[PDB]
């Protein structure tokens, strides 16, 4: 019971990270998107290796 908030956060994050995309209610299966955190991570590692 004292980690009942923690298991809810874990279930919410598990549903959140495997999120699907809909355009008008129905899902576009086989859709690939790259987030701005992923793109900024790629930019950060590329800037780090050119700087070194």
């Amino acid at each position: 019971a004292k980690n009942a908030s923690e298991v809810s956060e874990l279930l919410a994050k598990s549903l959140a990270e495997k999120a699907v995309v809909t355009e008008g209610g129905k899902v576009v299966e086989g859709f690939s998107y790259v987030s701005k955190a992923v793109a900024a991570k790629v930019i950060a590692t590329r800037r780090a290796e050119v700087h070194e």
């Binding site: 780090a48 290796e49 700087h51 070194e52």
Partner: protein, 49 residues
């Protein structure tokens, strides 16, 4: 005995970005020219005698 600059270029290339600046003095000293040590005397060799 290869030349010192290929050793400098190699030892800088195969060094990561975190251990770069700490490991510059060992690359400075590994490509320094040899100045041989002042050994013992045992002076007045056979031509001097």
């Amino acid at each position: 005995e290869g030349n010192s600059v290929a050793g400098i270029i190699k030892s800088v290339n195969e060094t990561s970005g975190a251990n770069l600046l700490s490991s510059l003095k060992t690359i400075k000293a590994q490509a320094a020219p040899i100045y041989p040590a002042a050994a013992s005397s045992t002076g007045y060799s056979t031509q001097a005698k």
